Design a protein around this ligand. Structure first.
Ligand SMILES: NC(=O)c1csc([C@@H]2O[C@H](COP(=O)(O)CP(=O)(O)OC[C@H]3O[C@@H](n4cnc5c(N)ncnc54)[C@H](O)[C@@H]3O)[C@@H](O)[C@H]2O)n1
Ligand SMILES: NC(=O)c1csc([C@@H]2O[C@H](COP(=O)(O)CP(=O)(O)OC[C@H]3O[C@@H](n4cnc5c(N)ncnc54)[C@H](O)[C@@H]3O)[C@@H](O)[C@H]2O)n1
Ligand SMILES: NC(=O)c1csc([C@@H]2O[C@H](COP(=O)(O)CP(=O)(O)OC[C@H]3O[C@@H](n4cnc5c(N)ncnc54)[C@H](O)[C@@H]3O)[C@@H](O)[C@H]2O)n1
Ligand SMILES: NC(=O)c1csc([C@@H]2O[C@H](COP(=O)(O)CP(=O)(O)OC[C@H]3O[C@@H](n4cnc5c(N)ncnc54)[C@H](O)[C@@H]3O)[C@@H](O)[C@H]2O)n1
Ligand SMILES: O=c1[nH]cnc2c1ncn2[C@@H]1O[C@H](COP(=O)(O)O)[C@@H](O)[C@H]1O
Ligand SMILES: O=c1[nH]cnc2c1ncn2[C@@H]1O[C@H](COP(=O)(O)O)[C@@H](O)[C@H]1O
Ligand SMILES: O=c1[nH]cnc2c1ncn2[C@@H]1O[C@H](COP(=O)(O)O)[C@@H](O)[C@H]1O
Ligand SMILES: O=c1[nH]cnc2c1ncn2[C@@H]1O[C@H](COP(=O)(O)O)[C@@H](O)[C@H]1O
Ligand SMILES: CCCCCCCCO[C@@H]1O[C@H](CO)[C@@H](O)[C@H](O)[C@H]1O
Ligand SMILES: CCCCCCCCO[C@@H]1O[C@H](CO)[C@@H](O)[C@H](O)[C@H]1O
Ligand SMILES: [K+]
Ligand SMILES: [K+]
Ligand SMILES: [K+]
Ligand SMILES: [K+]
Lengths: 334, 334, 338, 340
């Protein structure tokens, strides 16, 4: 078997060390745009978000309201695929025909032959294979089928890998963007598979950067899961992630499709995992945080502020200049 | 004194990182058979289990019912030896002439001269010297006696060492399989001897493989104790263990020779250690879990599924392909 | 991005290993004076404190009474700047004209143009640019303006950096002393910037000593925040810090400008961060309560006697000797988690 | 300042890995004797203990009863010096003329000119300078006075250091044995006061290495004592395996009937008093005051502990302490493992 020369780490084990902040670096001048899909060197991505946040492919988070709300702020949602092809297709259509908003859709490696056409006809701007382990022939086959039928006209995100090898496989398979994260989810012990979210992102980004140099193709990567604090967003971006996928964070908003409940005088909101027995056959609570616009605005202002402490006016600048340190276990145990 | 460059670790400190899962790797195609006794390169072991689980050499777990139930599922039990030579021989016989089922039996380094013949005559398929410290002349003497009288016809497992040095000694002594594990057991501080189960397995396996390349003799090793969760099974196997010995896991079952009791409305089963003042002169409660068949089925289904995430259809494949990472203490401390 | 070969640590992760104690090293002979502002090789700083303690630039700790009480013990306070220029200047004046006591003042990188002249006129002995991130052109600009107008006549501390790069920048910019500390404060998660206080001090100090070899200029550094126990003082000094800035420690005293409240039988004092909403509007911080400890004098005396005693276990009669002779070891997380 | 390439550790962070146990390595064949004072190569120590256990220099543990009981088991006690010279001297005399028993006495760097002569006259077999920081001129001066007046006739242990530098200094001053341990005692708040100390295991390991170098350099073997930090019996085996010739314990002995403290019932539990020598009461004839569980007679406890130690030694394939120190395989354990 193969072992590693060092243990994996989570976002909570790192801190950013300030760099030179110039007079022109004010939060208001910070550009949070980022590429969603792969593009060739010297060119621009066919799809660019204004903000680096995307909502999780979950019944408890990415519904119509969320897709529209998040799209309005510059992000994009991936309508959960744990429902019938018609339902999803409809939701996608609804978002597109609201008055245009970008919308994504999750797909599986089983019914893609009939699921993809529907989503495409429905107007989905981008798809993403949904899996806890994307390092497999099924994703290669699924992605290959899509290229076979739509060429580069259909954008499909892929996987969920945690190392260079997994990244490499999906990159060669054709994926437009690759998703990172196994076990870091807040609602994730069972199979004993996973890796610290921070280490997974750092390792995958290094591989992605090599790949770019080798092929001239820049494949955006998404840090999926593990975001507990706003500053985790800044760390994920600083470590190389182009955009971030969150579930819990969004589940707490008014726009999520879960019901608002009250527990012990506190207004909560339901939130369950896609791997739970209820979604797979198409569980917990999170504090109600209010409207998406208000929250997203706050989190990103904090992100923008921090970027300037690091001397960065753009995400690529941050990824280049960021100084990141590990923190001792005792420091965290405070 | 001799010191080590790194601290020893437990199974809870590791995670498996997915490998390439080919379309044909589905739980129903995974072969969980594994060798029980040493054989020559290129050949096969004389004894091969259908599943890599064996029950502990303890009064509270390996009785007649356990031996039959587990053998049915494809594993094997080592009838406890903290009882008269006549009693133990009786059990071995009952199991053998039930209607054939393989059964093991534990022996000690004191009365082996009469215990082994009785056990052998009763039809025991394999023996195992039972000790908390197999790194001793007594085990070498015992194996030497069995060889003197039966040559290679009687298979004898041996030890319980936690490093390459102990493994090498027992290998050269002639052991058919070597058991790993000191201080990792659930019901185990007193003498300050032991090692993290994970490091012990990793270290002994490395030595076992060197021995293989040097002699062409592959000696199976058993990871004994320390299994808290099902995923720990996959890890032990991935680290090189050919089979796993468990006590607590099996004590919880209906087939264990202990009585079922009720404590606070919760049905429990008695479970005490072989080092306790009662087994030696021939303690706690574990939750009742039901039938062995149903539990073993669920655990191994998880193991099979995980093996496929790792791209392995067989145990030897898992041991070769497995990517294993250490986890930060902060991560575990969650 | 740039990564570090080792995790940062806090003061609670270190212990001092004793050195040779001489017959004459007794607390009563230990000299605790330390330099406040940069000076050249072989020389003496123009401002030397009798004790290495200074109070934080916070509304909840450095008011007029604190300034007088701490100056009396040999230290110095930095009157908070989260108030109008007239009020702060008034405070400085009252301290200087009490009956003379040294006093400092915090300034910002925004209104320094008129804030500095007023504070200087009011009689402030030293100023300090107050910020959670001093690694910025604004600090260089502020010091530049000051040097342009008063040359070396006005002493100004600067920053709050946590690494050699930050120090080097502020040093070249002209700072009279550089303050270390981001995220180690007791009332500090949000932006995720910072570094363990011990590592920050150790790294900045190493850079400060290199700078000294290169330029012949010694720049005193201040370990700001993170002091929980008295022995943390000795450690901070041992690691290279010339003086220590504290907020919580002093807020607990009778002389702090905050009111006293009773929380379940215990007498407490209010203590809120300057990054909180209320101070900025004259949220990097919180609003808490620290146990009332009594008079500054008694407490400081108790803490320092502890420091002096430890210094002698280390074989040092002076702070510079300590920084030179100290044997410092990291302790296992298990040892701490006891 | 000076820093270290690695963090210090406590005894709880180590485990022993078995070695080859030969058929003849049985508890009843193990030799636990050990040298108490320095000797020259190829020679033997003028004082050898039958068991590597000595009792702390504390009012709460080393009184007359303790001294007699432990000496009977093959060890030795160091009568506490936080009392008048006449009192301490009387106690020593009592033990020596009980019916002969070896006994030790603690001394300080203040009144030694009058204290040493009295203790020697009373018949003390060995003295030991009692201090929390033995790395000082005062200890060298004290030892220098003793050498001047009695040459090598009077044996005196010294200090309490935690590193090679402190060891070397005391070794050069002329100490007959050196005590290791600062911040490891149970009744200590590992310096929430001064921030001085070092993990006991690392302190013993480091001091031992220097001791062995000093030996190769001078031919003089100086025994070292691991003082404090012993919680479990296996810590005893660890300390010895790490190179300690003998162990000094406070809490361990305080729990016994022979300790000079009172037995008191606390929540149905029979306890015994135990306070540090740096606590306000002993200094007025650093530490805290407390209770420990009553454990009964010293003989029964020391027998059980040492049986366990001997047994473990054989798991490591050692019949003697020097063999253990040579063959022991010691591993650090991950912090996660400890947090179990
Ligand atoms: N990120 C995480 O760590 C994590 C853990 S669970 C989880 C989420 O939970 C949800 C469920 O994930 P999942 O990976 O179990 C689902 P996925 O569809 O990838 O796999 C389920 C199973 O069906 C089988 N399968 C897939 N495609 C085929 C096919 N074409 N033909 C035959 N068999 C096939 C596979 O062997 C697999 O075991 C996901 O939506 C995901 O976002 N994420
Ligand atoms: N795996 C563990 O960490 C662990 C701890 S306790 C434990 C279990 O508890 C049970 C008891 O283990 P154990 O090691 O005490 C048993 P073992 O028989 O090995 O030893 C018991 C004692 O008898 C002595 N002895 C053994 N053979 C002889 C002989 N031929 N001549 C003279 N003396 C002899 C040994 O020195 C030993 O002290 C075992 O069944 C084992 O599985 N396992
Ligand atoms: N040490 C810590 O970790 C820490 C955290 S909060 C904190 C304290 O809280 C208080 C507030 O600190 P702070 O860093 O927010 C203050 P500072 O003045 O440095 O920054 C506040 C904001 O105003 C802007 N700003 C400053 N000067 C100018 C200028 N001249 N022109 C245009 N914009 C400008 C900056 O970009 C910054 O976002 C401080 O007193 C400090 O001691 N310390
Ligand atoms: N092991 C530990 O970590 C530890 C902590 S406290 C402790 C115990 O508590 C007790 C008290 O220890 P301690 O170190 O305070 C005592 P010690 O006598 O060694 O020191 C007390 C002080 O008096 C001074 N002093 C000593 N001799 C003289 C002299 N001759 N003339 C003038 N001044 C002098 C020294 O400077 C010293 O600071 C000890 O018995 C010890 O066993 N052990
Ligand atoms: O049932 C589940 N178990 C574990 N992870 C899940 C499950 N459902 C979704 N996830 C993952 O975790 C993310 C959510 O992360 P979160 O933002 O920490 O709640 C999703 O995008 C998935 O990758
Ligand atoms: O009394 C005992 N103390 C410690 N370990 C024991 C004892 N009896 C058996 N064991 C060991 O621990 C295993 C049990 O591991 P478990 O499955 O974690 O309960 C056995 O096979 C033995 O190797
Ligand atoms: O609002 C705030 N948040 C975090 N730190 C603060 C804040 N206000 C002041 N500080 C810092 O922390 C120090 C106080 O540290 P303390 O002594 O640990 O309470 C000050 O000198 C500042 O550098
Ligand atoms: O008051 C005290 N504080 C801290 N340590 C003490 C004190 N009194 C004695 N000691 C030390 O700690 C040992 C006790 O160790 P213990 O066996 O862990 O209780 C003694 O031999 C001393 O070296
Ligand atoms: C040579 C003198 C330089 C003085 C520098 C003053 C910097 C004050 O700061 C400036 O204040 C303005 C008014 O609030 C703002 O609009 C600017 O954005 C801000 O940078
Ligand atoms: C090239 C960009 C120059 C920006 C300089 C803006 C200066 C704004 O003006 C400044 O505002 C400060 C705050 O009120 C005052 O203290 C200064 O005296 C004043 O000059
Ligand atoms: K900055
Ligand atoms: K896979
Ligand atoms: K000293
Ligand atoms: K052994």
């Amino acid at each position: 078997a193969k072992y590693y020369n060092e243990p994996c780490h989570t976002f909570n084990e790192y801190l950013l060390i300030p760099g030179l902040s110039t007079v022109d670096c004010i939060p208001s001048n910070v550009n949070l745009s980022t590429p969603l899909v792969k593009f060739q060197k010297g060119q621009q991505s066919e799809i660019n978000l204004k903000i680096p946040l995307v909502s999780a492919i979950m019944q408890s988070v990415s519904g119509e309201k969320m897709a529209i709300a998040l799209a309005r702020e510059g992000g994009i949602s991936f309508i959960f695929g744990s429902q019938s092809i018609e339902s999803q297709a409809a939701m996608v259509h609804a978002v597109k025909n609201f008055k245009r908003y970008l919308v994504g859709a999750g797909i599986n490696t089983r019914d893609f032959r009939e699921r993809v056409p529907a989503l495409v006809e429905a107007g989905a701007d981008v798809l993403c294979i949904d899996s806890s382990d994307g390092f497999s022939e099924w994703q290669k086959i699924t992605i290959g089928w899509i290229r076979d039928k739509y060429g580069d006209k259909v954008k499909v995100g892929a996987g969920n890998i945690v190392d260079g090898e997994g990244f490499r496989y999906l990159a060669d398979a054709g994926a437009d963007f690759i998703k990172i994260g196994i076990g870091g989810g807040s609602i994730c012990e069972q199979k004993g598979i996973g890796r610290g979210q921070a280490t997974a992102v750092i390792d995958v980004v290094a591989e992605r950067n090599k790949y770019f140099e080798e092929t001239g193709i820049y494949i955006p990567v998404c840090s999926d899961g593990g975001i507990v604090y706003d500053y985790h967003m800044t760390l994920a971006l600083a470590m190389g992630a182009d955009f971030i996928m969150l579930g819990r964070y969004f589940a707490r908003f008014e726009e999520s499709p879960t019901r608002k409940v009250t527990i012990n005088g506190s207004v909560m909101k339901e939130y369950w995992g896609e791997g739970s027995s209820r979604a797979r056959n198409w569980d917990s609570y999170v504090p109600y945080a209010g409207k998406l616009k208000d929250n997203v605005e706050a989190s990103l202002n904090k992100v923008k502020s921090t970027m300037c402490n690091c001397g960065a006016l753009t995400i690529p600048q941050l990824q280049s200049k960021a100084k990141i340190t590990l923190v001792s276990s005792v420091s965290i145990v405070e």
